[PDB]
Design a protein around this ligand. Structure first.
Ligand SMILES: Nc1ncnc2c1ncn2[C@@H]1O[C@H](CO)[C@@H](O)[C@H]1O
Lengths: 295, 381, 362, 49
């Protein structure tokens, strides 16, 4: 019953399940797609299958598109990324290429919508390649950048924030926790809204593009997150070594700078207290012991 | 992965074990019209030529049993030797007595109505799942609506070669999800259904698939590999009570959750509000739906039990398959505040003296629009 | 906490719905004892003074149904008009249609009792069987055949398994004579019955007793209510625990998967738990059309196994043949036994084959 | 319905007897009130040898 249209790639994965649903609760005709776990909730479309991709962009007629396209760590060490921008630009669809802060060096906070990119790794680099590819194949596209994503997950490994929860629960095991590298948790439910409002605002201004930055205002490290997470469910916190060693590849900070994007009434920030508490209650041991097909 | 298969079945109005469930509920309805305080346990039998009633009834009402039986058999659609059976010419034996004095004195006599005791003892479950809009398992929802679609098309005439006996098994490939279950795709469908002589086998499958299946099942759950066994018997025209043996209450897993959650034994049909096999089973469903719709869990199973001549339940129990943030006691305590589950309060809350039971006789008692127990309570915690 | 309640019920031999179940398998016994390849779907309806037999049969046998019907009723103990029923007078109609020549099954087992059965129904059965025993001694000579029992256990959840902590509520109602006074009966049900049946550790002074809560139970048997075959399937199986696709067992022959595959599913699940691999398990075997072998098998071990489902499944594939034909062979399902199953439940009993664990090479 | 005592060696398909007779008489369709094919046959004979 709504009119103008959105397509969400990687809508099976964590970021995209929020992106798709966040459009589709404020009157949009929303249709996510994915390579794996698509049916029944989303359409089956491989991104590296170049025919199938245009086949659904053609048919549906999406006014706005939002590429997301994982199992987070990694957090140690493409290209149809942009081929999508080619096809998406043709049919007059504003592509929002979600990207990582890891494109940077990580030596001075912050980094601006403008600053020089200098990636230190495999990942960081090829997120840059995607921005070029996307942007030069169509200079009518936003490169909305995000930090580490937590969200309301189905399996822990879906987020580098959440994988830690097992470690946080079991006191009987002690494990260490990274404090050397600074970090920046952000709710996908919030990025879902920044993506939604940077689209409703593509009519109130008919030309927006040229990179965008968005993050959450809550600075932590793997360790500082862990202790918040204990303190949300009220658990023992002290089985957890910090470290300031480099167990040498990653940046040691990046941090984003959301000047431009805050300016137009485009933002949302759920507190990490709640954000994470609402995400990880199903993976309490006692709730896991209770989750079976039969009683 | 956490991928499991699961199958549930339904049957058509004109399957023997559901002819009885339905005749019984007709005799119930009959009595409740002239007398809402009728007590009725009417068990019914269907053999080749025969519908025999047996049971016990206390009811001021006088009822023409010959007419009620034959009118319902007609409604079901058996009217000729062409088909298995025929209300006009069938044997109807009655063996209904007055009810046992020893139950009367210690169940419903001389008592303020909210404190009438359980009709019998026993255990009843009631279950709910966020997997569908109707808070029922996809398997059993799809299964029922196939036999519903079949009968609808039989009656309105677009498929006149249809005949009332049918069976439908629906297997679905499910996935676990933080305690809840997620339907992915319909793995196998089966439909055998009694047919006319004229219509040939290959028009029937072509029909079942485009007229019936496609209408009922959202194309999201179907793909190429979805398997279809439409009329896999072939020679299914000789169908109904003929050759066979029906009984009331031999289809209790179809009558309820298609094999999900749990079931505590009790048959529903032919019984009134004082039989907690029925009343408290509608109530426990009311509970478990109200909890899920009220967002307290995605999935829950509830058990209650009663003792004969004792108004309060002996035990409420809440299993929420780990799908609520609230613990299982927290939900149980909410249920104490918001429900009085004695049989004398349930009758009010759900209007169980109105003669509406013949609707519930087929296609399931749970997960349907009008039914009182399907309207969730706004909960106050 | 992590403390919960759960209730289950059983009925005595004399209950009209169970009378029927015995007679249907009596009639089955009777046919196989001649033609061991008999095909049988024998319903039984019992109501004041009547036993009606219904439904298709195919056999080579000649069965004197009068003999069969009455010998069961005699056994169950209804022999004089005063009890409401008598095998000497009861009318025996017969409507069987003799001749002369798909879905899903569940098994369950639990570590909480010697018999791998949910404690709730174990005790419920034992009470009815204990009554019948005492009736048949003439220790309690004022007993009559029809009875009913319900047992609410207070469990604790523990690492996927369930720990029975106490008996919380017990209900017994049994048909009696018009002589014996009410106190004598409730004082007898407690000491000579319940205290004989239930481990003293599970009983204490808060355990709630409903002994003859009906007040008076003289009229009963096929008189007090109509009785029908296959109307107590949760009493016949796992008492509310586990799961149930919906197969009525009694009066069906071994060629009914509903019954045979059900028994094997139990056999398996019990073997698995008895074999030290699970504390608790549900086993879900789904037969499809055009497959000798079960198409799928799921094993829900409630996380009480040091092994995965795949690991557990593999053990099963290399220990068990669950092709319907093999199951009838492995479990000796042509003996005239079945009448013995139709009372006090099919699972948890040592005389039976499917209750004898296969020792597992893996 | 069949009723009353017999003493015999013969085993007899009462289904068959009762139906083939009801056919020979000519009750063949439920259009006529009765049909050898659809009618109930109850037996209540009390047979020994
Ligand atoms: N007075 C009674 N008290 C308790 N249970 C009874 C009574 N009469 C019959 N029953 C049992 O309950 C069922 C129907 O109420 C019967 O099958 C019988 O076993």
């Amino acid at each position: 019953i709504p009119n103008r249209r959105v397509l969400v790639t990687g809508a099976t994965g964590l970021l995209g399940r929020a992106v798709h649903k966040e459009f589709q609760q404020n009157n949009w005709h929303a249709v996510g797609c994915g390579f794996r776990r698509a049916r029944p909730k989303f359409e089956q479309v491989n991104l590296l299958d170049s025919n199938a991709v245009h086949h659904i962009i053609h048919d549906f007629q999406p006014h706005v598109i939002v590429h997301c396209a994982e199992r987070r760590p990694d957090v140690v060490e493409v290209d149809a990324s942009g081929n999508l921008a080619k096809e998406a630009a043709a049919v007059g669809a504003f592509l929002i290429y979600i990207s990582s802060d890891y494109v940077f060096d990580g030596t001075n906070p912050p980094y601006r919508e403008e600053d020089i990119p200098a990636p230190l790794n495999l990942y960081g680099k090829t997120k840059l390649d995607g921005e070029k590819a996307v942007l030069e194949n169509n200079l009518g596209a936003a490169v909305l950048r995000i930090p580490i994503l937590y969200g309301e997950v189905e399996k822990l490994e879906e987020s580098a924030v959440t994988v830690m929860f097992d470690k946080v629960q079991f006191s009987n095991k002690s494990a260490n926790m990274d404090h050397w590298q600074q970090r920046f948790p952000t709710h996908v439910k919030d990025v879902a809204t920044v993506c939604r409002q940077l689209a409703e605002k593509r009519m109130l201004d008919p030309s927006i593009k040229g990179t965008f930055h968005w993050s959450g205002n809550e600075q932590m490290t793997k360790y500082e997150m862990a202790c918040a997470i204990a303190d949300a469910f009220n658990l023992p916190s002290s089985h957890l070594r910090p470290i300031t060693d480099s167990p040498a590849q990653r940046p040691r900070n990046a941090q984003l700078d959301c000047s431009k994007l805050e300016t137009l009434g485009i933002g949302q920030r759920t507190p990490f207290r709640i954000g994470i508490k609402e995400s990880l209650w199903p993976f309490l041991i006692d709730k896991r012991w209770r989750q079976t097909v039969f009683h | 992965e956490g991928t499991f298969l699961f199958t549930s079945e339904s049957v058509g109005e004109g399957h023997p074990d559901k002819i009885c469930d339905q005749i019984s509920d007709a005799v119930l309805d009959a009595h409740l019209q002239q007398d809402p305080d009728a007590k009725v346990a009417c068990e019914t039998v269907a053999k080749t030529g025969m519908i025999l009633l047996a049971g016990e009834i206390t009811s001021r009402a006088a009822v023409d049993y010959q007419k009620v039986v034959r009118e319902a058999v007609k409604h079901i659609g058996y009217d000729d030797s062409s088909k298995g059976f025929d209300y006009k010419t069938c044997n109807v034996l009655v063996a209904l007595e007055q009810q046992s004095p020893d139950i009367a004195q210690g169940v419903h006599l001389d008592r303020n109505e909210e404190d009438i005791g359980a009709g019998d003892q026993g255990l009843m479950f009631g279950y709910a799942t966020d997997e569908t809009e109707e808070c029922m398992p996809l398997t059993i929802v799809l299964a029922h609506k196939l036999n519903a679609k079949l009968a609808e098309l039989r009656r309105n005439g677009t498929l006149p070669w249809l005949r009332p006996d049918s069976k439908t098994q629906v297997t679905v490939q499910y996935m676990q999800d933080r305690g809840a279950v997620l339907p992915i795709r319909v793995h196998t469908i089966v439909i055998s259904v009694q047919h006319d002589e004229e219509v040939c086998l290959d028009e029937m499958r072509d029909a079942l698939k485009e007229k019936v299946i496609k209408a009922v099942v959202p194309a999201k759950y179907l793909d190429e590999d979805t398997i279809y066994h439409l009329q896999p018997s072939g020679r299914f025209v000789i169908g109904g009570p003929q050759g066979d043996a029906g009984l009331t209450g031999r289809k209790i897993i179809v009558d309820t959750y298609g094999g999900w959650g749990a079931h505590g034994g009790g048959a529903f049909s032919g019984k009134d509000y004082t039989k907690v096999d029925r009343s408290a089973a509608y109530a426990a469903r009311w509970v478990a739906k109200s909890l899920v719709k009220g967002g307290l869990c995605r999935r829950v199973l509830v058990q209650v039990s009663y003792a004969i001549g004792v108004s309060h339940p002996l035990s409420i129990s809440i299993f929420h398959y780990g799908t609520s943030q609230k613990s299982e006691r927290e939900l149980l305590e909410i249920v104490k505040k918001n429900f009085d589950l004695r049989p004398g309060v349930i009758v009010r809350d759900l209007d169980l003296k109105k003669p509406i039971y013949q609707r519930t006789a087929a296609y399931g008692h749970f997960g349907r629009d009008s039914f009182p127990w399907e309207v969730p309570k706004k909960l106050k915690y």
